[PDB]
């Protein structure tokens with residue numbers, strides 16, 4: 001696993017990518033690591049933002065599945081032609097596998113101008129694979145065809161240019177301190193989990209925990225933000241707003257309509273609360289909490305063309321897809337996707353950005369009653 005440590009790169013806000021090779025001879029692409037989706041889809045046409053792209057005509061081991069896929073978002077979309085070919089991961093295990101590939105032939109708001117990736121690796125489960133669960137995701141293909149164990153772990157750092165590690169098939173104990181705690185994967189579609197309690201600085205939100213997982217809580221390397229549903233966002237904001245009242249800021253900033261700024265060497269960390277999410281634990285009435293800092297939900301806007309100060313976006317934001325534990329959360333922690341045991345483990349990350357006062361923590365056990373009532377149906 002030394003071989004896999006530090007095999008992820010990226011740029012702030014533009015996600016984390018791993019090098020992969022597709023086809024024979026191998027074509028190298030940088031692929032986005034995305035636990036919020038289940039499709040393996042690379043650019044197959046010379047879109048002008050793309051550094052590289054898949055040239056099926058150059059690969060002897062390509063096979064057309066003679067079907068299409070249309071995949072919309074808001075209001076991004078991509079569209080492609082299904083096939084299969086031999087995929088490999090240079091800084092992953094030493095294997096080559098035949099996985100499904102969507103040759104992306106048309107997209108909107110999908111590719112990022114500036115980014116250095118050309119495709120997406122959906123690592124979540126078949127139930128949400130487009131066009132349907134017949135299309136076996138890459139990781140299912142990898143485990144099904146090799147002795148690679150049914151688990152992967154992610155250490156997302158971010159110091160600009162970000163870095164991380166995706167350990168395919170195991171856990172690198174150097175990447176985290178203290179102990180892993182595990183929350184059950186509630187269903188194998190997205191990596192769904194159940195938040196049972198939310199505190200800000202310590203004081204909980206006393207809010208029907210069901211609203212925390214309405215209609216989903218997921219773990220999503222594809223998203224930058226911590227995204228909370230409507231009311232929860234409201235409630236958290238108000239409490240973060242209160243907690244933080246040493247100063248005042250515009251209403252827009254909280255809604256991610258504005259940025260807020262201080263000068264170099266002049267941000268007040270402490271004037272901001274910590275956030276704790278308690279997650280359903282492995283045993284009945286047993287939970288554990290993950291605690292982030294504001295260095296995780298105030299992320300600098302790398303380069304703001306009309307400003308030479310220190311600004312930051314409020315990286316907590318609202319939703320109707322559900323809760324979304326994105327970069328904000330995952331950068332605090334080493335996150336083990338133990339697919340083999342339907343569970344996600346969290347440990348304080350050896351590379352997260354702490355100061356000398358506070359630190360990100362994973363702690364337990366706590367006693368939380370009625371944890372199954374927080375899930376929605």
Ligand SMILES: Nc1ncccc1NCc1ccccc1
Pocket residue numbers: 015032034035036037073110120220221222223
């Ligand atoms: N996982 C995920 N979350 C939110 C929106 C999209 C998404 N997957 C597709 C995606 C495309 C481009 C960049 C990031 C994610």
